[PDB]
Amino acid sequence: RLILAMDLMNRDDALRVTGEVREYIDTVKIGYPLVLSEGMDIIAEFRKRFGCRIIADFKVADIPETNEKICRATFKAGADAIIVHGFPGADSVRACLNVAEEMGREVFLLTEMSHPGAEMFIQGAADEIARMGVDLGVKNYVGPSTRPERLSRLREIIGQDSFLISPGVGAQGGDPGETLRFADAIIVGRSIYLADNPAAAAAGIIESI
Amino acid sequence: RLILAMDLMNRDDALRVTGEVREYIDTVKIGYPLVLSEGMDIIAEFRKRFGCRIIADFKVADIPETNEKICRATFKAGADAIIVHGFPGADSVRACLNVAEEMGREVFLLTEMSHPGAEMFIQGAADEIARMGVDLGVKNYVGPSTRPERLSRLREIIGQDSFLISPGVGAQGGDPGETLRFADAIIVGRSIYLADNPAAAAAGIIESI
Ligand SMILES: O=c1ccn([C@@H]2O[C@H](COP(=O)(O)O)[C@@H](O)[C@H]2O)c(=O)[nH]1
């Protein structure tokens, strides 16, 4: 129930840490910090080398037409799933869902973010964004570890069968065990990749659940 | 290093056995016996339910144009890789490789088959088919467990870095350990799915390596 947020910028460091913690994870979340530094080919390299599923955390937040282009390039690169923002509206989410269907891949809908600023505008729209996801047939969601009461509310809207992953564990203050009361899996970045011993840090997090 | 050949025709039986042996495998090979009975949607169901990579063993063996169509439908259905025959020639293999590139997926090249009849025509062309794969950039191959001397020859042609999987273990007479001297992974169907205790059969095969 642990997903590694691999946000190191250097290919060598990213490969090192991911290989060291492979036995504790089942999925690697790759985002723009690594892709904009090393290129989209890094996705296929990771999938080949480690055999883990790859979620591209691109927080797609464009108009429908451009969203389609971004999702197509991401799935062509080998990503198993892509994280998309729901705040830009239903048409923008639908465009992503359409490409995922054509490619046999998945879309994860980001409904409420984990950082402090998320309270300014996203939080007030989060329940509606989640309801929109349900209405559109979304089955994978992303919610905040830093606000378990909001994670519980999100779980209430999407149901027990939907898959919910949650970032904000560790560095941002979120707790593994409390977060897993509501989410299916936790996303952990810095607590693992900046540790003196990433494998020990990952083992420790799992042991704490 | 164990791949389950799930050739049961009934969805309920297929799900039962696959779930029972999940801890012993890392990939599920799905072919026409299950797909033509339960539909292509079974691929996405398996990927979702068990989280295993899915190799579609469709032994694609058509003209280039039709090969492209078959691969596109297979990848749209969610398969991570497709097994293609090399005997129809380079243009037919290239068509599959082109679709895999557009979709961010993989092609496995079947070079020599495991059954007795494979000696009639395929065996004599197998080294050339493997060389063709190398020339086309193929990195995933399928060779026979039933003829380890041929599996060794295939490994010699494709190199140590190419990934080689091998069917014919168990029911067809192939030995797990001997096959793994040359292949990276073994494919096992009936020895596991027809066993009174599939999980015990899988554990036994792994224990025998
Ligand atoms: O609401 C969200 C959505 C995504 N992420 C992402 O999850 C990871 C969390 O990393 P860390 O704080 O564990 O280091 C980062 O890649 C970050 O972009 C969040 O932190 N919060």
Ligand SMILES: O=c1ccn([C@@H]2O[C@H](COP(=O)(O)O)[C@@H](O)[C@H]2O)c(=O)[nH]1
């Ligand atoms: O040369 C080949 C290529 C593919 N397969 C496939 O691998 C599986 C082997 O099943 P079993 O003999 O372990 O039951 C079946 O799905 C079969 O179609 C072979 O057996 N031999």
